[PDB]
Write a protein that binds this ligand. Structure first.
Ligand SMILES: NC(=O)C1=CN([C@@H]2O[C@H](COP(=O)(O)OP(=O)(O)OC[C@H]3O[C@@H](n4cnc5c(N)ncnc54)[C@H](OP(=O)(O)O)[C@@H]3O)[C@@H](O)[C@H]2O)C=CC1
Ligand SMILES: NC(=O)C1=CN([C@@H]2O[C@H](COP(=O)(O)OP(=O)(O)OC[C@H]3O[C@@H](n4cnc5c(N)ncnc54)[C@H](OP(=O)(O)O)[C@@H]3O)[C@@H](O)[C@H]2O)C=CC1
Ligand SMILES: COc1cc(C[C@H](CO)[C@@H](CO)Cc2ccc(O)c(OC)c2)ccc1O
Ligand SMILES: COc1cc(C[C@H](CO)[C@@H](CO)Cc2ccc(O)c(OC)c2)ccc1O
Lengths: 285, 284
């Protein structure tokens, strides 16, 4: 009843935000969603937002250009999660100023969910959070399945190729492919977890640590068709986004440091039966 | 098992199309959704399409610029429903339907004002009828999301807080319909022998309301009256504003009777269509 953590989700109509909204409701949190003036005959945003009320969330109107309305919104919750487009990341600095003036917020989870930026606008938001003394949790370390697994890490499409695939290097660099729904559930589980206050939580579910070639081979075993592979060397991979890609697939930046059980999502929350990539890929068959 | 009508939905990731996909699934039709290539780069579209598979729909890949893929798609079904916007894109669909020869009925992208009073939809209708393709035209409603939830105010989709523009005297009857009900009516009519080669008017009786009636439904829900500013026809100097003028000044959705044999809520009385007082509650 009154036991619930009250969470405000900022960016709740986004790809990752909507998942976090639902994950927070499904965890049992009293879930609030920031409603931005953005009606501009955006029928998708509107109906998504109001679909949340049917599930029991509440909407809080505020505007990022109206400092006191952000202050007013965060004063109604205990915890703030932001999941902005990732100019949107730096918009969170206004959010930090409001949390700081509000004084009531117990934890802020900024818009991370990807490459650890501590190896740039995400770092600027971390520094602001830590400067203001706002307790935080940084959720990092995953490749979104929809942008990297469903297309077999090909670019410019979101579904499996039918005949041919580009392999980056030899495709033996380890990558972390995670269904975005699992990222959202780990986020909902960790945001009031005392174990993860002021920590980085790595989302590295063990069985989803895979090379690209391992991901491709999962697909070939599902379809029973060998794809024609073309290996692309680091140098042929001669704008920033291709740079993100190079750090993941050529430098192994998601897997090159081990992580402890006290800081890895699937060990912290072993009850989350995360989606393996053979299961994830079946929907495309 | 296999006594189900097979239906292909074109435009399945759009506002109406997605509703029609689900309504066909809910009606028990073996449901197919056209999967177009430019879908591949849009994660909203992709998650939508593939979520249909989890509900039991199949996807058919085809492209409008590839006649043979259209032909191959329509040979897998018995009925085709299109819900676009690109209205003229349906011409390619018609030639495909024509060549395949197996389609028992085509429902083109209508779901608004009957164009045959009022253009690109008429061109499509001419092509449908010139090819001898049996048809059903679903018309006659204002989408509740675009006209009811905003109390028919413009530039917003949610109820206003204080002011509201009343058009004329707000005494002209308009037809406000939950898009879900339009879709279910479509799903129910598409294989119904009474509606072959007919126009079906979606005009549920309790939802024939003047704008002022709609506003008063909201005031009874909030307990607050709003500031009303009336706008004369002439101040009503966008071709969406023309649509609006026809609806709220000329009353073009309601200036003509429709018979029970051609009105969806009489044809399909088990559809408990959403009344506007229920529809607006979500905004309280
Ligand atoms: N492979 C991976 O690991 C992936 C990780 N990410 C990361 O996840 C996080 C969320 O990314 P993503 O889901 O793609 O973001 P989205 O593009 O889906 O946007 C989500 C929300 O951001 C808000 N937003 C966007 N632009 C603005 C703006 N100018 N002003 C105010 N609000 C804005 C909106 O809030 P509202 O809903 O209220 O309208 C929107 O709903 C990011 O940190 C991103 O880097 C993203 C890609 C894949
Ligand atoms: N007040 C009212 O009653 C309203 C009436 N309508 C009517 O409803 C019907 C459907 O409209 P609506 O659901 O709002 O449409 P949308 O704007 O939601 O678009 C629907 C789908 O049409 C496809 N599409 C759009 N452009 C193209 C194109 N150039 N080529 C190929 N496909 C395209 C796409 O299908 P895909 O998923 O396959 O990519 C798109 O997702 C129309 O006849 C319209 O006049 C619409 C608005 C309100
Ligand atoms: C994994 O870690 C991160 C991942 C991201 C998302 C990246 C970059 O934006 C995605 C696009 O969103 C790349 C991509 C993938 C497939 C595609 O077909 C594609 O076409 C252009 C682009 C951001 C930050 C991260 O830390
Ligand atoms: C009922 O008759 C029809 C109705 C439509 C929908 C029309 C567009 O054409 C809607 C937008 O899609 C107009 C609109 C609505 C609300 C708004 O806040 C708005 O911003 C100003 C503009 C289509 C075809 C029809 O036959």
């Amino acid at each position: 009843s009154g036991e619930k953590t009250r969470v405000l989700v900022v960016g709740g109509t986004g790809t990752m935000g909507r998942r976090i909204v639902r994950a927070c409701l499904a965890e049992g949190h009293e879930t609030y969603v920031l409603q931005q003036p953005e009606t501009r005959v955006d029928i998708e945003k509107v109906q998504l937002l109001y679909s949340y009320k049917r599930l029991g969330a509440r909407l809080i109107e505020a505007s990022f250009s109206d400092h006191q309305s952000l202050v007013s919104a965060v004063k109604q919750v205990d915890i703030v999660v932001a999941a902005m487009s990732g100019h949107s990341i730096l918009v969170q600095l206004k959010l930090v100023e409001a949390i700081k003036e509000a004084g009531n917020i117990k934890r802020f989870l900024p818009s991370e969910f990807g490459m650890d930026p501590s190896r740039d606008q995400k770092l600027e938001v971390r520094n602001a959070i830590e400067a203001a003394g706002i307790p935080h949790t940084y959720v990092v370390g995953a490749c979104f399945a929809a942008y990297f697994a469903g297309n077999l890490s090909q670019m410019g499409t979101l579904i499996p190729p039918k005949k041919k695939v580009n392999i980056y290097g030899d495709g033996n660099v380890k990558v972390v492919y995670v269904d975005e729904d699992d990222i959202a559930e780990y986020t909902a589980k960790t945001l009031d977890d005392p174990r993860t206050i002021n920590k980085t939580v790595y989302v590295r579910p063990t069985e989803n640590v895979l090379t690209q070639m391992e991901l491709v081979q999962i697909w070939e075993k599902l379809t029973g068709k060998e794809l024609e592979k073309t290996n692309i060397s680091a140098n042929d991979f001669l704008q920033a986004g291709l740079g993100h890609f190079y750090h993941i697939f050529y430098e192994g930046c998601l897997t090159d440091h081990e992580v402890g059980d006290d800081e890895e999502a699937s060990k912290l929350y072993p009850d989350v039966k995360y989606t393996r990539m053979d299961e994830y890929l079946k929907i495309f068959l």
